[PDB]
């Protein structure tokens, strides 16, 4: 369990982020949610999580594209919750295009959220973790933080950056009760992905599930999607005492993506 | 939990292997112990484990250096336990010497036990796991399956082979409800390592714990040993449904060894 | 040889960059130099290289911290030289400090030059290379693009980013006569490093060379520095026809740094 | 150049090994050929090579599956050639089958030749290289020493072991004027692969070259084969002084195989 601990999860108002925040809450950890979205809908999620798991749940709409904002998200978390035991840097954005066609504005935005945001968040939380003698920095990178795909230069670059940053984080905190690791997910069945499937479903005129496997065939050997619940359970493990000596490494949850 | 599941662990009469069998048994899984040791003490361990966790526990002293013996271990486990959901290939041995001074006999022995045993055990288990629709093969490799250390050629080569063998195993079973991963431990405080600490403590004229940190300094940033309880906890995570899509990968538990 | 080909090397007015530019010029390749420095001194280097190797050598002081400037460097190279066969993205900057003490301004500058500069340069050259059916993008990353060191988060993050970006570059150009690889250097004996040695030379009161080995002991097993000439010879190899099917990978020149 | 140097290449009577021995011989190095084949044709190759490059060329048909035979190859090479500056461990064999269907005999044979041979050869060569103050051990591994493919367990495991063994070799020799690296080839158009292309071309009813691209599509992004001339060129680079500080690493020549 994680009773008495505080977890801050960026981009957790939905999808993967929400899956991890939910997994941590179920372990008895207080949660600070974050990300853009509908204020009303967001409150519903927050209150729903708080009630369902009997833990304190807050929401900070801090803009992760801004360094001061990310650092502020962490400070206020400590001010409201009293400490920050776990920091899950999850927020991510993407864009597909050949390198020579890749918009500089897109490249900069992707680096800012997927990479720089991890630095600012980590920089803000480290002092508190070193003081308390306990810390768990869980960066959600990607299979693309280990290998590449054509047309995703900025994302691949940013994610690799995260893995490298995770390693440094671990070395600077080694032995202080703090660990830093990066979960590298393969395909996850997001709403936009679902529309990508339906785009192939009506492209080949096959049922959704067949299209699903079609979409996974190229990169994911298992032909099965990774779920937010599994990624939550992975974050839960890394935050456990059994993962005390697991630091500066990656945990690939990709159905065999990086094995071949 | 793992209630209703059968886990076989090679080299589990003590240390790492024992820690793993215990963590699994603690989750409700029936256990099959194995490994060379003292018959009297082995029975005490076997009986104690069964009584402690209220699960069926057997012991098979099959000689892991013998291919047919490894397969026999698996075969008999199925016959006596009813199935084999989890296979933890843990047994290993080492020898230190320059390549040119490495006895061919030692080279052959390390490869047979540290690598070939994983193949024979995996081969015998796969038909059952594929038929059951469930399987978790967990190979206890080492940080030396990812990086190298001078004077440990046979061990590094064998462990590297284990990581590779693990990846193939995953690809051949992808999607069939079976996963295969390799846990890569760093320094563990075994009884033989303890003697190493004492020897160093004497040579340097410092306390046992100062020597421990000193011994760990070159390879393990944390300056803390990995424990059999931690590795057991890691195996428990990998055998869980949360790790259903974690396959063909490595999970480093090395206090930062491989981060730098 | 590389007669008739054009090479653009960023940050080549001195050190590693100049070593590579010199190595390429010696192969008969026209060169476009770049980087900040003394205008007069720079001209001396340019004219000296041109005369010594009988090839056309130009100098473009374009500021690599600016995206439009990097792209301009490449365009003008093509305008003046007639094409761009080889692009060596070398320019790098660093800063040592704990993550929580790392200045955002420093983090941003490091990412901008060491990572973003590679993207802009590559984006500008790709159209020309795809048109001509020949290309060699040689990114000078670092051992830190593969592993980490404490207190160098931004550099480690940027370099890892470069390796990931190099992989994408390769995949988007695979089979088009273009390859993209990243040379990952270990310790190189730079002027600032020389002062780091002399700082240890007078710190332990030992001769320079002893201090040199002292400085290399922790990360570089060979206890020998990598030279700009060796890095030049490595770039030369990757640009050769024999390296036609070497793409999307790294070439570690680190005296065993990443082997352990 | 490599004039005055002696290079021994296992499995060099044809294909990759031959391409490597030829590139080395082309640089002025004396050569020692080896490998099973037709005596008559082997002599034609041996004699031709010596005449073509004006260097001494011998042939030793030592059975690489025998440990003492491998060491004998090295021993005799020194006695007849005067020394051994370069050792290229190239010989290899394969077999495809599911793990549970993999013959133990095949598993043992692949490990003996693909992995143990590298150990025996390295062990016999090291004493001479350390005494000479010069040495270049080049192990021809494979992309399968870094990643995996289904149904190739023994090959992947053995090649992975070779990469690991290469790293240890480098660390044990670091600084002594000796380097040890592993070249990791992707698809090469061997005579047996040619038959594979024809078979596929027939089954798909397409021309030989269309089938070639089709066969390469799954693993090699470039859709182009790696050549023995390229691998020879790669070996020549690694044996050069420019690669003096390249040690304990892998050089992937796989058309992008390992980038994704
Ligand atoms: C494979 As990706 C999840 O990080 O979109
Ligand atoms: C570093 As170990 C526990 O594999 O000897
Ligand atoms: C090891 As570094 C050269 O890239 O300063
Ligand atoms: C992929 As290969 C040339 O090692 O068979
Ligand atoms: Mg609203
Ligand atoms: Mg007894
Ligand atoms: Mg001036
Ligand atoms: Mg004949």
Tab-separated table of C-alpha atoms in Angstrom, chain D residues 55-164:
chain	number	residue	atom	x	y	z
D	55	UNK	CA	50.813	-11.016	-49.264
D	56	UNK	CA	51.417	-14.352	-47.570
D	57	UNK	CA	48.241	-16.423	-47.368
D	58	UNK	CA	47.850	-19.783	-45.658
D	59	UNK	CA	44.854	-22.001	-44.947
D	60	UNK	CA	44.143	-23.962	-41.779
D	61	UNK	CA	41.175	-26.314	-41.923
D	62	UNK	CA	40.934	-26.572	-38.135
D	63	UNK	CA	37.520	-27.799	-36.924
D	64	UNK	CA	36.154	-24.718	-35.129
D	65	UNK	CA	33.669	-26.849	-33.166
D	66	UNK	CA	36.663	-28.224	-31.236
D	67	UNK	CA	38.104	-26.006	-28.507
D	68	UNK	CA	41.670	-27.278	-28.779
D	69	UNK	CA	41.413	-27.006	-32.560
D	70	UNK	CA	40.529	-23.306	-32.384
D	71	UNK	CA	43.435	-22.607	-30.043
D	72	UNK	CA	45.616	-24.665	-32.376
D	73	UNK	CA	44.588	-22.444	-35.284
D	74	UNK	CA	45.843	-19.398	-33.408
D	75	UNK	CA	48.952	-21.197	-32.131
D	76	UNK	CA	49.954	-22.352	-35.622
D	77	UNK	CA	49.194	-18.959	-37.133
D	78	UNK	CA	51.742	-17.364	-34.813
D	79	UNK	CA	54.323	-20.070	-35.556
D	80	UNK	CA	53.887	-19.805	-39.328
D	81	UNK	CA	53.099	-16.096	-39.611
D	82	UNK	CA	55.315	-14.731	-36.846
D	83	UNK	CA	52.517	-13.120	-34.836
D	84	UNK	CA	48.780	-12.430	-34.702
D	85	UNK	CA	47.744	-8.793	-34.783
D	86	UNK	CA	44.176	-9.344	-35.941
D	87	UNK	CA	41.661	-12.031	-35.016
D	88	UNK	CA	38.310	-12.042	-36.793
D	89	UNK	CA	35.974	-14.607	-35.245
D	90	UNK	CA	33.469	-15.054	-38.057
D	91	UNK	CA	32.326	-18.675	-38.415
D	92	UNK	CA	28.694	-19.387	-37.568
D	93	UNK	CA	25.734	-21.712	-38.191
D	94	UNK	CA	21.958	-21.571	-37.763
D	95	UNK	CA	18.767	-23.573	-37.305
D	96	UNK	CA	15.130	-22.450	-37.207
D	97	UNK	CA	12.477	-24.017	-34.950
D	98	UNK	CA	10.216	-23.175	-32.006
D	99	UNK	CA	12.014	-23.444	-28.685
D	100	UNK	CA	10.090	-26.588	-27.751
D	101	UNK	CA	11.000	-28.140	-31.110
D	102	UNK	CA	14.661	-27.111	-31.058
D	103	UNK	CA	16.914	-30.208	-31.084
D	104	UNK	CA	19.305	-30.219	-28.128
D	105	UNK	CA	22.011	-31.291	-30.575
D	106	UNK	CA	21.428	-28.185	-32.696
D	107	UNK	CA	21.363	-25.958	-29.619
D	108	UNK	CA	24.713	-27.348	-28.458
D	109	UNK	CA	26.279	-27.069	-31.912
D	110	UNK	CA	25.242	-23.460	-32.459
D	111	UNK	CA	26.590	-22.420	-29.060
D	112	UNK	CA	29.861	-24.268	-29.604
D	113	UNK	CA	30.628	-22.670	-32.954
D	114	UNK	CA	28.939	-19.286	-32.652
D	115	UNK	CA	30.015	-18.577	-29.090
D	116	UNK	CA	32.529	-20.959	-27.563
D	117	UNK	CA	34.765	-20.679	-30.638
D	118	UNK	CA	35.113	-16.934	-29.971
D	119	UNK	CA	36.248	-17.699	-26.414
D	120	UNK	CA	38.828	-20.336	-27.400
D	121	UNK	CA	40.162	-18.182	-30.213
D	122	UNK	CA	40.335	-15.072	-28.040
D	123	UNK	CA	42.043	-16.925	-25.183
D	124	UNK	CA	44.818	-18.257	-27.432
D	125	UNK	CA	45.364	-14.881	-29.079
D	126	UNK	CA	45.433	-12.584	-26.042
D	127	UNK	CA	48.848	-13.599	-24.628
D	128	UNK	CA	50.471	-12.751	-27.974
D	129	UNK	CA	48.580	-9.502	-28.430
D	130	UNK	CA	49.383	-8.306	-24.908
D	131	UNK	CA	53.070	-9.097	-25.443
D	132	UNK	CA	53.124	-7.395	-28.870
D	133	UNK	CA	51.439	-4.301	-27.471
D	134	UNK	CA	48.984	-4.488	-30.365
D	135	UNK	CA	45.739	-6.309	-30.981
D	136	UNK	CA	42.433	-6.101	-32.811
D	137	UNK	CA	39.809	-8.717	-32.042
D	138	UNK	CA	36.800	-8.354	-34.317
D	139	UNK	CA	33.863	-10.634	-33.593
D	140	UNK	CA	31.308	-11.016	-36.362
D	141	UNK	CA	28.127	-11.159	-34.310
D	142	UNK	CA	24.776	-10.141	-35.785
D	143	UNK	CA	21.798	-7.862	-35.386
D	144	UNK	CA	20.651	-10.922	-33.467
D	145	UNK	CA	23.256	-10.125	-30.832
D	146	UNK	CA	21.265	-6.981	-30.032
D	147	UNK	CA	17.649	-7.907	-30.784
D	148	UNK	CA	15.697	-11.106	-31.368
D	149	UNK	CA	13.682	-12.991	-33.982
D	150	UNK	CA	11.225	-15.804	-33.321
D	151	UNK	CA	12.434	-19.387	-33.919
D	152	UNK	CA	16.129	-18.539	-33.703
D	153	UNK	CA	16.751	-19.111	-29.991
D	154	UNK	CA	20.170	-20.776	-30.122
D	155	UNK	CA	21.480	-18.227	-32.644
D	156	UNK	CA	20.171	-15.180	-30.784
D	157	UNK	CA	21.428	-16.490	-27.442
D	158	UNK	CA	24.886	-17.287	-28.851
D	159	UNK	CA	25.253	-13.955	-30.665
D	160	UNK	CA	24.068	-12.090	-27.583
D	161	UNK	CA	26.764	-13.962	-25.684
D	162	UNK	CA	29.320	-12.899	-28.270
D	163	UNK	CA	28.467	-9.230	-27.722
D	164	UNK	CA	28.838	-9.716	-23.982
